[PDB]
Ligand binder design. Structure first.
Ligand code: HEC
Ligand code: HEC
Lengths: 125, 125
Protein backbone atom coordinates (compact mmCIF):
# COMPACT_ATOMS: atom_id res chain seq x y z
CA UNK A 1 0.00 0.00 0.00
CA UNK A 2 3.07 2.24 -0.03
CA UNK A 3 4.21 4.24 -3.00
CA UNK A 4 7.75 4.60 -1.62
CA UNK A 5 9.51 3.07 1.43
CA UNK A 6 9.20 6.29 3.41
CA UNK A 7 5.44 5.89 3.23
CA UNK A 8 5.84 2.56 4.98
CA UNK A 9 8.04 4.15 7.67
CA UNK A 10 5.50 6.88 8.34
CA UNK A 11 2.74 4.39 8.48
CA UNK A 12 4.47 2.16 10.98
CA UNK A 13 5.45 5.07 13.14
CA UNK A 14 1.90 6.32 13.18
CA UNK A 15 0.60 2.85 14.10
CA UNK A 16 3.10 2.46 16.85
CA UNK A 17 2.32 5.91 18.19
CA UNK A 18 -1.38 4.96 18.39
CA UNK A 19 -0.33 1.71 20.27
CA UNK A 20 1.26 3.15 22.26
CA UNK A 21 -1.27 5.72 23.43
CA UNK A 22 -3.85 2.95 23.81
CA UNK A 23 -1.49 0.92 25.83
CA UNK A 24 -0.02 3.67 28.01
CA UNK A 25 -3.29 5.35 28.82
CA UNK A 26 -4.15 2.27 30.90
CA UNK A 27 -1.13 2.71 33.17
CA UNK A 28 -2.97 4.77 35.82
CA UNK A 29 -5.76 2.15 35.92
CA UNK A 30 -3.30 -0.75 36.34
CA UNK A 31 -1.60 1.22 39.14
CA UNK A 32 -4.91 2.08 40.85
CA UNK A 33 -4.38 5.78 40.44
CA UNK A 34 -7.51 5.98 38.17
CA UNK A 35 -10.71 3.98 38.59
CA UNK A 36 -11.28 0.57 36.96
CA UNK A 37 -14.35 0.57 34.68
CA UNK A 38 -14.32 -2.89 33.19
CA UNK A 39 -16.37 -1.85 30.09
CA UNK A 40 -14.10 1.15 29.44
CA UNK A 41 -11.04 -1.10 29.51
CA UNK A 42 -12.64 -3.87 27.45
CA UNK A 43 -13.42 -1.34 24.71
CA UNK A 44 -9.97 0.22 24.84
CA UNK A 45 -8.26 -3.15 24.60
CA UNK A 46 -10.35 -4.00 21.59
CA UNK A 47 -8.91 -0.79 19.87
CA UNK A 48 -5.43 -1.86 21.01
CA UNK A 49 -5.74 -5.33 19.64
CA UNK A 50 -6.80 -3.96 16.14
CA UNK A 51 -3.90 -1.45 16.24
CA UNK A 52 -1.44 -4.10 17.50
CA UNK A 53 -1.77 -6.08 14.27
CA UNK A 54 -0.96 -3.09 11.97
CA UNK A 55 2.78 -2.14 12.19
CA UNK A 56 4.14 -5.47 10.98
CA UNK A 57 3.02 -5.33 7.39
CA UNK A 58 4.82 -1.97 7.03
CA UNK A 59 8.31 -3.59 7.57
CA UNK A 60 8.12 -5.35 4.23
CA UNK A 61 11.12 -5.98 1.97
CA UNK A 62 13.09 -2.82 1.11
CA UNK A 63 11.30 -0.60 3.74
CA UNK A 64 14.55 0.02 5.64
CA UNK A 65 14.41 3.40 7.33
CA UNK A 66 13.28 5.21 10.41
CA UNK A 67 14.51 3.92 13.73
CA UNK A 68 14.23 0.31 12.48
CA UNK A 69 17.47 -1.66 12.81
CA UNK A 70 18.62 -3.55 9.63
CA UNK A 71 18.55 -6.71 11.74
CA UNK A 72 14.70 -6.61 11.23
CA UNK A 73 15.42 -7.77 7.69
CA UNK A 74 18.53 -9.92 8.06
CA UNK A 75 16.96 -11.72 11.09
CA UNK A 76 13.45 -11.98 9.74
CA UNK A 77 12.54 -15.24 11.66
CA UNK A 78 13.53 -13.64 14.97
CA UNK A 79 11.57 -10.49 14.21
CA UNK A 80 8.36 -12.45 13.19
CA UNK A 81 8.91 -14.42 16.45
CA UNK A 82 8.96 -11.25 18.54
CA UNK A 83 5.91 -9.72 16.84
CA UNK A 84 3.94 -12.94 17.09
CA UNK A 85 4.93 -13.20 20.81
CA UNK A 86 3.78 -9.61 21.33
CA UNK A 87 0.48 -10.35 19.57
CA UNK A 88 0.02 -13.49 21.68
CA UNK A 89 0.55 -11.33 24.81
CA UNK A 90 -2.17 -8.97 23.45
CA UNK A 91 -4.51 -11.98 23.26
CA UNK A 92 -3.92 -12.56 26.96
CA UNK A 93 -4.63 -8.90 27.68
CA UNK A 94 -7.87 -9.08 25.69
CA UNK A 95 -8.90 -12.18 27.67
CA UNK A 96 -8.19 -10.41 30.96
CA UNK A 97 -10.17 -7.27 29.79
CA UNK A 98 -13.01 -9.45 28.64
CA UNK A 99 -13.11 -11.20 32.08
CA UNK A 100 -13.30 -7.87 33.93
CA UNK A 101 -10.52 -8.98 36.25
CA UNK A 102 -8.17 -6.19 37.50
CA UNK A 103 -5.51 -8.69 38.78
CA UNK A 104 -5.30 -10.52 35.55
CA UNK A 105 -5.34 -7.15 33.66
CA UNK A 106 -2.30 -6.01 35.68
CA UNK A 107 -0.32 -9.16 35.03
CA UNK A 108 -1.23 -9.19 31.28
CA UNK A 109 -0.33 -5.49 30.97
CA UNK A 110 3.06 -6.14 32.35
CA UNK A 111 3.58 -9.08 30.01
CA UNK A 112 2.70 -6.87 27.07
CA UNK A 113 5.00 -4.12 28.15
CA UNK A 114 7.94 -6.50 28.51
CA UNK A 115 7.27 -7.70 24.95
CA UNK A 116 7.42 -4.07 23.68
CA UNK A 117 10.75 -3.61 25.43
CA UNK A 118 12.19 -6.90 24.22
CA UNK A 119 11.60 -5.99 20.64
CA UNK A 120 12.95 -2.51 21.08
CA UNK A 121 16.12 -3.66 22.74
CA UNK A 122 16.83 -5.95 19.67
CA UNK A 123 15.33 -4.08 16.76
CA UNK A 124 14.86 -0.36 17.50
CA UNK A 125 17.82 1.96 17.15
CA UNK B 1 -5.06 10.43 27.68
CA UNK B 2 -2.75 13.31 26.76
CA UNK B 3 -0.20 14.80 29.10
CA UNK B 4 0.03 18.02 27.05
CA UNK B 5 -1.97 19.33 24.04
CA UNK B 6 0.83 18.46 21.63
CA UNK B 7 0.34 14.83 22.55
CA UNK B 8 -3.24 15.14 21.36
CA UNK B 9 -2.08 16.74 18.08
CA UNK B 10 0.38 13.94 17.42
CA UNK B 11 -2.19 11.37 18.22
CA UNK B 12 -4.76 12.79 15.86
CA UNK B 13 -2.26 13.19 13.09
CA UNK B 14 -1.17 9.61 13.49
CA UNK B 15 -4.79 8.41 13.43
CA UNK B 16 -5.59 10.42 10.38
CA UNK B 17 -2.47 9.19 8.63
CA UNK B 18 -3.57 5.58 9.26
CA UNK B 19 -7.07 6.51 7.82
CA UNK B 20 -5.95 7.63 5.35
CA UNK B 21 -3.73 4.77 4.23
CA UNK B 22 -6.61 2.35 4.81
CA UNK B 23 -8.89 4.46 2.78
CA UNK B 24 -6.53 5.35 -0.07
CA UNK B 25 -5.14 1.89 -0.55
CA UNK B 26 -8.57 0.89 -1.89
CA UNK B 27 -8.44 3.44 -4.70
CA UNK B 28 -6.97 1.03 -7.29
CA UNK B 29 -9.66 -1.55 -6.43
CA UNK B 30 -12.50 0.99 -6.79
CA UNK B 31 -11.00 2.05 -10.14
CA UNK B 32 -10.59 -1.55 -11.35
CA UNK B 33 -6.86 -1.21 -11.69
CA UNK B 34 -6.36 -3.92 -8.96
CA UNK B 35 -8.52 -6.99 -8.44
CA UNK B 36 -11.59 -7.04 -6.17
CA UNK B 37 -11.29 -9.67 -3.41
CA UNK B 38 -14.42 -9.15 -1.37
CA UNK B 39 -12.91 -10.71 1.82
CA UNK B 40 -9.76 -8.56 1.52
CA UNK B 41 -11.88 -5.42 1.29
CA UNK B 42 -14.28 -6.45 4.05
CA UNK B 43 -11.33 -6.92 6.41
CA UNK B 44 -9.70 -3.65 5.39
CA UNK B 45 -12.90 -1.70 5.90
CA UNK B 46 -13.27 -3.19 9.34
CA UNK B 47 -9.76 -1.68 10.18
CA UNK B 48 -10.88 1.61 8.63
CA UNK B 49 -14.06 1.77 10.62
CA UNK B 50 -12.11 1.24 13.96
CA UNK B 51 -9.57 3.91 12.91
CA UNK B 52 -12.31 6.29 11.70
CA UNK B 53 -13.69 6.65 15.22
CA UNK B 54 -10.30 7.64 16.79
CA UNK B 55 -9.28 11.21 15.73
CA UNK B 56 -12.28 12.98 17.24
CA UNK B 57 -11.53 12.49 20.89
CA UNK B 58 -8.10 14.10 20.34
CA UNK B 59 -9.66 17.54 19.46
CA UNK B 60 -10.80 18.04 23.03
CA UNK B 61 -10.90 21.42 24.78
CA UNK B 62 -7.57 23.29 24.72
CA UNK B 63 -5.93 20.94 22.11
CA UNK B 64 -5.55 23.76 19.58
CA UNK B 65 -2.53 23.10 17.38
CA UNK B 66 -1.35 21.35 14.29
CA UNK B 67 -3.18 22.07 11.08
CA UNK B 68 -6.51 22.25 12.96
CA UNK B 69 -8.39 25.51 12.39
CA UNK B 70 -9.64 27.32 15.59
CA UNK B 71 -13.12 27.10 14.11
CA UNK B 72 -13.07 23.40 15.27
CA UNK B 73 -13.54 24.79 18.77
CA UNK B 74 -15.61 27.92 18.22
CA UNK B 75 -17.99 25.99 15.88
CA UNK B 76 -18.13 22.78 17.87
CA UNK B 77 -21.71 21.77 16.74
CA UNK B 78 -20.70 22.07 13.07
CA UNK B 79 -17.53 20.06 13.63
CA UNK B 80 -19.39 17.22 15.53
CA UNK B 81 -21.90 17.33 12.61
CA UNK B 82 -19.16 16.80 10.03
CA UNK B 83 -17.45 14.00 11.97
CA UNK B 84 -20.73 12.23 12.63
CA UNK B 85 -21.63 12.59 8.90
CA UNK B 86 -18.23 11.12 7.98
CA UNK B 87 -18.76 8.23 10.42
CA UNK B 88 -22.24 7.63 9.00
CA UNK B 89 -20.67 7.47 5.50
CA UNK B 90 -18.20 4.88 6.91
CA UNK B 91 -21.21 2.81 8.02
CA UNK B 92 -22.43 2.79 4.44
CA UNK B 93 -18.98 1.73 3.24
CA UNK B 94 -18.92 -1.11 5.79
CA UNK B 95 -22.36 -2.25 4.59
CA UNK B 96 -21.19 -2.24 0.97
CA UNK B 97 -17.96 -4.20 1.92
CA UNK B 98 -20.00 -6.64 3.92
CA UNK B 99 -22.35 -7.21 0.91
CA UNK B 100 -19.41 -7.94 -1.42
CA UNK B 101 -20.83 -5.54 -3.98
CA UNK B 102 -18.23 -3.63 -6.09
CA UNK B 103 -20.82 -1.06 -7.38
CA UNK B 104 -22.03 -0.18 -3.98
CA UNK B 105 -18.37 -0.13 -2.72
CA UNK B 106 -17.51 2.44 -5.42
CA UNK B 107 -20.42 4.71 -4.61
CA UNK B 108 -19.80 4.46 -0.81
CA UNK B 109 -16.08 5.15 -1.31
CA UNK B 110 -16.84 8.29 -3.15
CA UNK B 111 -19.30 9.40 -0.47
CA UNK B 112 -16.62 8.89 2.15
CA UNK B 113 -14.03 10.79 0.22
CA UNK B 114 -16.34 13.77 -0.25
CA UNK B 115 -16.89 13.81 3.52
CA UNK B 116 -13.09 13.93 4.11
CA UNK B 117 -12.83 16.87 1.72
CA UNK B 118 -15.79 18.72 3.21
CA UNK B 119 -14.27 18.68 6.62
CA UNK B 120 -10.89 19.71 5.35
CA UNK B 121 -12.21 22.61 3.37
CA UNK B 122 -13.88 23.99 6.61
CA UNK B 123 -11.56 22.89 9.38
CA UNK B 124 -8.05 22.06 8.10
CA UNK B 125 -5.61 24.87 7.51
C1 HEC C 1 4.09 -2.43 23.06
C2 HEC C 1 2.65 -1.99 23.40
C3 HEC C 1 4.77 -1.34 22.20
C4 HEC C 1 4.79 0.02 22.36
C5 HEC C 1 4.04 0.86 23.42
C6 HEC C 1 5.58 0.58 21.27
N1 HEC C 1 6.11 -0.43 20.57
FE1 HEC C 1 7.69 -0.28 19.23
N2 HEC C 1 8.98 -0.10 17.52
C7 HEC C 1 9.55 -1.17 16.87
C8 HEC C 1 10.50 -0.65 15.88
C9 HEC C 1 11.35 -1.50 14.96
C10 HEC C 1 10.24 0.77 15.89
C11 HEC C 1 11.04 1.78 15.00
C12 HEC C 1 10.06 1.98 13.84
C13 HEC C 1 10.61 2.94 12.80
O1 HEC C 1 11.04 4.05 13.18
O2 HEC C 1 10.74 2.62 11.61
C14 HEC C 1 9.39 1.11 16.97
C15 HEC C 1 8.91 2.34 17.31
C16 HEC C 1 8.05 2.62 18.34
C17 HEC C 1 7.59 3.94 18.73
C18 HEC C 1 7.96 5.28 18.02
C19 HEC C 1 7.13 5.53 16.80
C20 HEC C 1 7.41 6.87 16.17
O3 HEC C 1 6.45 7.69 16.27
O4 HEC C 1 8.46 7.02 15.50
C21 HEC C 1 6.80 3.81 19.80
C22 HEC C 1 5.96 4.89 20.40
C23 HEC C 1 6.68 2.40 20.07
N3 HEC C 1 7.47 1.64 19.22
C24 HEC C 1 5.86 1.88 21.05
C25 HEC C 1 9.34 -2.49 17.21
C26 HEC C 1 8.38 -3.07 18.04
C27 HEC C 1 8.13 -4.48 18.25
C28 HEC C 1 8.83 -5.59 17.42
C29 HEC C 1 8.13 -6.94 17.32
C30 HEC C 1 7.20 -4.57 19.22
C31 HEC C 1 6.54 -5.81 19.81
C32 HEC C 1 6.87 -3.22 19.61
N4 HEC C 1 7.66 -2.30 18.91
C33 HEC C 1 6.02 -2.88 20.60
C34 HEC C 1 5.62 -1.64 21.05
C1 HEC D 1 -11.48 10.65 5.02
C2 HEC D 1 -11.16 9.15 4.88
C3 HEC D 1 -10.23 11.40 5.55
C4 HEC D 1 -8.92 11.29 5.15
C5 HEC D 1 -8.32 10.32 4.12
C6 HEC D 1 -8.15 12.23 5.97
N1 HEC D 1 -8.99 12.93 6.73
FE1 HEC D 1 -8.54 14.71 7.72
N2 HEC D 1 -8.02 16.25 9.10
C7 HEC D 1 -8.93 17.00 9.81
C8 HEC D 1 -8.20 18.06 10.51
C9 HEC D 1 -8.84 19.11 11.40
C10 HEC D 1 -6.82 17.72 10.30
C11 HEC D 1 -5.64 18.59 10.85
C12 HEC D 1 -5.26 17.81 12.12
C13 HEC D 1 -4.11 18.47 12.86
O1 HEC D 1 -3.08 18.74 12.22
O2 HEC D 1 -4.21 18.82 14.04
C14 HEC D 1 -6.71 16.67 9.35
C15 HEC D 1 -5.58 16.05 8.90
C16 HEC D 1 -5.52 15.02 8.01
C17 HEC D 1 -4.31 14.40 7.49
C18 HEC D 1 -2.85 14.81 7.88
C19 HEC D 1 -2.42 14.18 9.16
C20 HEC D 1 -0.97 14.47 9.50
O3 HEC D 1 -0.23 13.46 9.44
O4 HEC D 1 -0.67 15.61 9.93
C21 HEC D 1 -4.66 13.46 6.61
C22 HEC D 1 -3.74 12.46 6.01
C23 HEC D 1 -6.10 13.38 6.62
N3 HEC D 1 -6.67 14.36 7.44
C24 HEC D 1 -6.81 12.45 5.91
C25 HEC D 1 -10.30 16.83 9.75
C26 HEC D 1 -11.05 15.77 9.22
C27 HEC D 1 -12.48 15.59 9.31
C28 HEC D 1 -13.39 16.49 10.17
C29 HEC D 1 -14.73 15.91 10.62
C30 HEC D 1 -12.78 14.51 8.55
C31 HEC D 1 -14.13 13.84 8.31
C32 HEC D 1 -11.53 14.03 7.99
N4 HEC D 1 -10.47 14.86 8.37
C33 HEC D 1 -11.41 13.00 7.14
C34 HEC D 1 -10.28 12.44 6.56
Amino acid sequence: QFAKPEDAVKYRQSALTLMASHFGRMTPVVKGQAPYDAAQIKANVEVLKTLSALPWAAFGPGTEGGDARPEIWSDAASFKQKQQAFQDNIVKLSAAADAGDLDKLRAAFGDVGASCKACHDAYKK
